[PDB]
Design a binder for this molecule. Structure first.
Ligand SMILES: NC(=O)C1=CN([C@@H]2O[C@H](COP(=O)(O)OP(=O)(O)OC[C@H]3O[C@@H](n4cnc5c(N)ncnc54)[C@H](OP(=O)(O)O)[C@@H]3O)[C@@H](O)[C@H]2O)C=CC1
Ligand SMILES: NC(=O)C1=CN([C@@H]2O[C@H](COP(=O)(O)OP(=O)(O)OC[C@H]3O[C@@H](n4cnc5c(N)ncnc54)[C@H](OP(=O)(O)O)[C@@H]3O)[C@@H](O)[C@H]2O)C=CC1
Ligand SMILES: NC(=O)C1=CN([C@@H]2O[C@H](COP(=O)(O)OP(=O)(O)OC[C@H]3O[C@@H](n4cnc5c(N)ncnc54)[C@H](OP(=O)(O)O)[C@@H]3O)[C@@H](O)[C@H]2O)C=CC1
Ligand SMILES: NC(=O)C1=CN([C@@H]2O[C@H](COP(=O)(O)OP(=O)(O)OC[C@H]3O[C@@H](n4cnc5c(N)ncnc54)[C@H](OP(=O)(O)O)[C@@H]3O)[C@@H](O)[C@H]2O)C=CC1
Ligand SMILES: NC(=O)C1=CN([C@@H]2O[C@H](COP(=O)(O)OP(=O)(O)OC[C@H]3O[C@@H](n4cnc5c(N)ncnc54)[C@H](OP(=O)(O)O)[C@@H]3O)[C@@H](O)[C@H]2O)C=CC1
Lengths: 297, 297, 297, 297, 297, 297
């Protein structure tokens, strides 16, 4: 609604987030998806049936293909959201996540710098991150955490493009990991709104964070086993018990703005507070009662 | 004292840690240093005056040179300790730390796998890490955190070599960052002992951690301003107020063994405790009195 | 049934062909799948629920990851079947098919040569090709055609491994391209049998071809519109009207062996016949009657 | 005669075709040759003795050298004609032809895209192909066939440069391969005229084909053994009995224009005819009588 | 004094020469240092305490980092002075000097050509060479000798930037190599003056040489052993007995201009003299008396 | 005559030297030529008509192709002789000579080290150098000079293979450069004998030099203008007036052995003489009379 008449290029836009972004913006914008699997390209074209949706086959690891594609499109907005789904299998296939996440993003970022003179339209770059990047404890989270610093780094040296990140928890859109596990609650539409908000209202170099309630995963799964038994699988390798969105180091540079928090870039000398805090899914937890009402609505 | 008659190869062994390792082991072992600055090689050769010390000029980033050097030496033990000194300047020179830390280590690790048949002597690989790798908040710490997972990963697939990490805080061997800042106290000899302990007593895939007291950095600097004024500079970019050596996720797989703690590899299904804890420099802090007595001894 | 107690490694084994090969051989063999999408790995593991199935995340384009994986597994048999599904989109994304097909195969083939001494188990390499590689007219077919020559080339220089190809048409397991279009008829199980036959009964350097009936695609689609209207879309870019399995040049070196034909390697001086022929889907075409009976059974 | 006052850059212009192009255009144009062997550069300079001929030493495989050279010259016209002479030795040295043909052309093509802003003069790019690229049966032909699709691909995305191909048979300017072998007859001057015609009259994305008579190679060799015995060597590896210039798939998009045929680009939806045909050296064959009269003139 | 209001970028400017250049020009110019060791960056910043000094962490071997840095700075002047100190250890670590010297310089030079349109400010490039590059006899000298030809080469093709070299002997700012060894005498300030002179008064493609007296190294060391015994170590590997600044081939194209000699570029047809000469430290040697007076002043 | 029953692999063996080596050794040895131009391969095969001669198409720049070829052949002897003919055109195409000479040789040398375990037969490696590598003054000579040090370097670290160089002047097998120009006189057969002598009688790490008379080039050309006028062209770019085979630095480590001189490796501490000398074509020059008698015989 504040993104209109734009060409939006999305790396990894053939998944859930990508398809929701397309549904949301295709009526008023050109959308270019860049991803590897052309089967999904085919099905997407059949769904939207619009010349305003273009797919490019390519791997974000491939600098040449990334550079050629960005220069062909000359987009106003770039959104980076390419990554694997099952985060835990990064742990013993580490090269695979380093390359897709770190190298992929450094490919896109590099084009915006070295080929800046050929990208007259580019105004904003939005990297989609994850709560797993905050105080990370697994390879996937560590790589995403590095990705954020790379975005912050470009924002320091390249002043005429807005570089922002968003960081969020699990999107909702019988098995139980652990009875103590907590997560933040958010929907696929919340993700999209977060992304637009950051593009429009975030400042270059910021990491923007949504204000979310949280739940015991056990409370949720219990509900589903009544509308519709439960096996308790163990923790996966590298998995933590809770989600953290802001840690005490970041909290000192976090400006709260109602529904969203803006983590100021590290190169900003401003100290917001010395009353440090953590923002995690272990606090402000919905009752089972409250969770039931939310899932219902 | 349990490392004798070995050929020990150290990447980045021309600094403080490298020189202490040389002083400690040169009487009974062959030592090969691999690092970039040949001025330090020259001075080191003049100091030790021993044919048992060999220097190779090379960058750990350079896979070809790393591979050729390891295959020439065929060491019993490899220690990786290459990194920059001023950790904060990684933050806007990120490629520089990704390459030296992540790519450098993946070069060494790769040789041990792909060239295993040419390395008949290799028994142990020890990666030297840092408390900044625990719940990391800056690019340097994030990269080191990834390095640990890479070492753990090789330990899963390569069963006939011991791959271990050690993780420690600041080594002690007028300006003040912040009056609230805490650090763990350890000496250069403690570092070395930690490294030997891990090589001898660590198991493949473990990250081994020293039991250390901690101090208010302010308490220390105050002492020095009496034996011998103090400026309070601000926090540097990416710097945290305290050091953390074990976080609550790792604590669930940590086996305490007296003076050292062994973090079991992520692929080990064993749950040691569900009473999670954090091990950080904000707890068990020495009084100024106690710190004075320690610095004295 | 003649493949037992083997470790079989399949590049691109998470699709239709891969899953059928797994169903067929998992009871008596170790199966390793190498492919990019770990979502399919997850679902496959849930289906077969066997420790005899292992997935590796990796791109066949990635020489390092391919080499490391083959050396870890040390398989008896390698099957290469990685490619995209919608063949026509290669035509304006050519780099994408050159890399996955030509470069991917030259990665696997190279490991078998340069790392031969570390692959003590390897006995057979089977490249899965396509009728589109015969007198090719589109980029996908041209790239596959080159792949075959690469397999034939290794077979000339590496005498102690069997390198074979199979080439086949469309696998069966409302829209109409063109009323004149013909295809060969074969099922997913026919594909598998072809692959086993080539591994067991093919000679190194041969390209083995199945004897198949063919159909008017119009005849087929007409049937489905009665059991269950039809739109006639045009030809796609690069698409031919028929499938060809042997052309007149290959026919001179083709040894027929009942249900299969063996195209002798180009370096074999043997001239089988000078009565050249073409083997294509435009000849020996089933009546609608005959096609109905076949689809029924 | 319609190419005047141009700077023409030729990759592989030190051979027969290159030297004829130089003789034809040097009086009125700047000619830059790019090729590997400086002995031929030396001799050529001695022959033409003109400052209007410049040689650059370089391999078309070498992207850096190709890019630097094109940007230095800033030509109006680029002609690509680099390849080996003895086509059959590609068959067991496949990497060599993939690199020179496919990679070489993708180097030149890439410069025209990524460095477009530095190439203000470039108007036309002409790729020189071969009848062996039509329904190809050997590695050389397959690689050239792919080259054509690459040229067609650039023509789709880059609208302000004309990208064209020409495809032709053997140029005429005692041993017999096979008594049944046929070839198209054309001279070195015909080649040049074809190239100019395509540059001037071809449209971007077309492959332009000459109307040629054909001959039994036996008829020709018999003549030479009278003006001036004959050994019948066998077919070489990968060699076909005849030359094909248009196949039945291409025939449906071929516009005949008198002395030349224009194969429309695959992305053009236009269907010229559904009365498909093949254009090959097995049809319209000169009598020995007719061939003698032609060779005479 | 003729370099004012410029941005000067120095590769390898954290050593002796770099620090002197900074002291000399920082009052009136922006100085950017590019080098690997950030410890020296830190100390330098503490010394000069000026925002007019900027350090970039990077290796000259790293084309990407070199290109990104030059394009960020857009300097008026580039000075290349990166190399190792102990020249003799190049001899059995040859790759290390080829990469830092030859590849490093070809990285910088390439940016000035391929990225010329993004470097609107660049006016001069000064390569710092050494007498060891004249009739070289060791790997270090040979590599520097090649570096000079690379600078001369760019000067031929790139007409709107001044590319110059300077070549000099040992800078002065108990052990004896050999009693016969001679060297040219020059100070650190002489080096700087030479560099400025070449930038201002050298022509593109020239190598500019200082007029210097020379000394027996034995004469010097004898003096120091009186103000303040002497060990005679042998020659090092690859070391010559004397320094040569101009050889007889270069002498034929050398224009003397008082305090400096200008070696004309090889592509200049001008023959200055056929009375060839050598300019070396074996001639015009100071007496011990004369050397004492010079060292005193 | 002391090389029998060997497999000899020659890089760049399709030229004059290569063909003479083949004529000399083919009766009693297997010869493998590795070079780029397959036209020369074809003609050579027609000349020798022997299965004992094998050609591989490849560029010495191409590490992969070099490594694959050496491992396929597993030769007893490797001779490196690949370079361009017109030495002066290196001067403004420097990358071309750096790559073919330095990078080409480091490709071959590297295979002998990293793939040593797969090269059970390799006994000797002979690099063919040139007098232009002695006190070099042009890019070609500088690159060859570096090549020699690379060969000497491998000889230091790899003790079970003999690495040797030979260095020689012009081979004899109307225009005048300059009336003062001198050259050493040697024939193509002298070259071959030198090569065999070095392989058999040279020690690892030595550079072996032939004892040769020299001539005024003017004296020679005058003779040819009587048996059969003369133009005096100028010096070419980078050309020196004379050839030097030993310089005063090398002379101190040169052991004379009658018809050949052996330059001891730089890492050999042995000082042969301190009575340094130069060995060049400006001394011991034949009279016109003497030259006439020599050319006659
Ligand atoms: N609950 C959630 O789903 C959460 C999601 N996020 C973030 O959202 C983003 C996307 O999530 P979601 O839409 O659910 O993800 P999906 O798994 O549904 O798809 C992600 C996309 O990335 C693409 N991709 C993966 N690897 C590559 C590659 N190497 N090159 C090019 N494209 C690639 C995939 O396409 P293809 O396979 O065809 O190449 C796919 O289009 C991620 O950044 C993630 O960190 C964060 C927190 C929670
Ligand atoms: N208080 C402390 O000092 C602490 C240290 N550590 C760990 O200890 C280890 C070493 O510390 P310390 O000895 O103090 O470090 P130093 O700064 O004194 O030296 C580190 C070494 O790394 C080398 N090096 C840096 N970059 C490269 C490169 N690209 N290629 C090859 N070598 C390189 C340097 O040699 P050169 O420059 O010549 O190449 C030097 O020899 C590090 O891993 C660090 O994480 C952890 C916590 C605290
Ligand atoms: N009858 C015929 O001759 C026919 C020719 N053609 C086409 O004509 C074109 C040229 O034919 P023709 O002139 O006879 O060929 P030539 O064999 O006479 O020479 C071809 C040129 O390519 C150059 N070349 C080869 N490899 C490379 C490389 N890797 N890098 C740079 N240059 C290279 C050669 O120069 P150098 O070796 O010095 O590098 C030479 O100048 C080819 O594209 C061919 O397909 C098509 C049909 C028939
Ligand atoms: N007597 C003398 O000192 C003479 C000097 N010269 C010339 O002067 C120049 C510099 O001399 P001087 O100042 O004494 O040298 P120093 O040894 O004092 O330092 C040289 C500089 O080069 C840098 N450097 C080395 N390798 C690299 C690399 N791979 N990437 C980036 N930077 C690198 C070093 O920084 P860092 O290590 O931090 O990367 C350092 O800043 C050289 O070109 C030399 O040839 C010539 C004749 C005599
Ligand atoms: N008077 C003389 O001729 C002298 C010769 N020498 C030395 O003798 C050696 C050879 O001389 P000569 O036989 O006359 O040389 P030629 O010019 O006759 O041929 C040299 C060989 O090198 C090959 N070659 C060149 N570049 C490459 C490359 N990039 N990859 C693979 N092969 C390549 C050529 O084959 P192709 O082009 O097909 O690739 C050719 O076979 C050289 O090392 C030279 O330094 C030294 C002094 C004098």
């Amino acid at each position: 609604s504040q993104i209109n008449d734009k060409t939006i290029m999305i790396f990894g836009g053939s998944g859930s987030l990508g398809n929701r972004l397309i549904e949301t913006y295709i009526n008023n914008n050109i959308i270019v998806n860049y991803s590897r699997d052309e089967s999904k390209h085919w099905s997407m074209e059949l769904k939207y049936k619009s010349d305003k949706l273009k797919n490019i086959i390519g791997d974000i690891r491939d600098f040449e293909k990334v550079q050629q594609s960005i220069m062909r499109i000359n987009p106003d907005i770039i959104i980076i959201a390419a990554a694997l789904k099952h985060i835990d299998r990064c742990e013993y296939e580490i090269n695979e996540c380093l390359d897709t996440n770190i190298k992929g993003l450094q490919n896109v970022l590099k084009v915006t710098e070295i080929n800046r003179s050929n990208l007259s339209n580019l105004k904003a770059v939005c990297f989609v991150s994850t709560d797993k990047a905050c105080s990370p404890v697994n390879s996937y989270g560590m790589s995403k955490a590095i990705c954020e610093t790379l975005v912050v780094e470009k924002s320091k040296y390249i002043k005429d493009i807005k570089y922002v990140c968003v960081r969020y928890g699990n999107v909702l859109n019988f098995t139980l990991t652990h009875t103590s596990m907590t997560r933040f609650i958010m929907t696929l539409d919340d993700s999209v709104k977060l992304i637009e908000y950051a593009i429009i209202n975030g400042n270059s170099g910021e990491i923007v964070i949504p204000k979310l309630n949280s739940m015991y995963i056990k409370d949720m799964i219990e509900l589903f086993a009544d509308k519709y038994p439960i096996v308790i699988t163990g923790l996966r390798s590298g998995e933590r018990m809770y989600e953290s969105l802001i840690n005490d180091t970041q909290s000192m540079k976090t400006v709260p703005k109602g529904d969203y928090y803006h983590i100021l870039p590290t190169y900003d000398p401003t100290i917001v507070t010395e009353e440090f805090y953590e923002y995690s899914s272990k606090q402000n937890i919905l009752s089972k009662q409250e969770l039931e009402n939310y899932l219902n609505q």
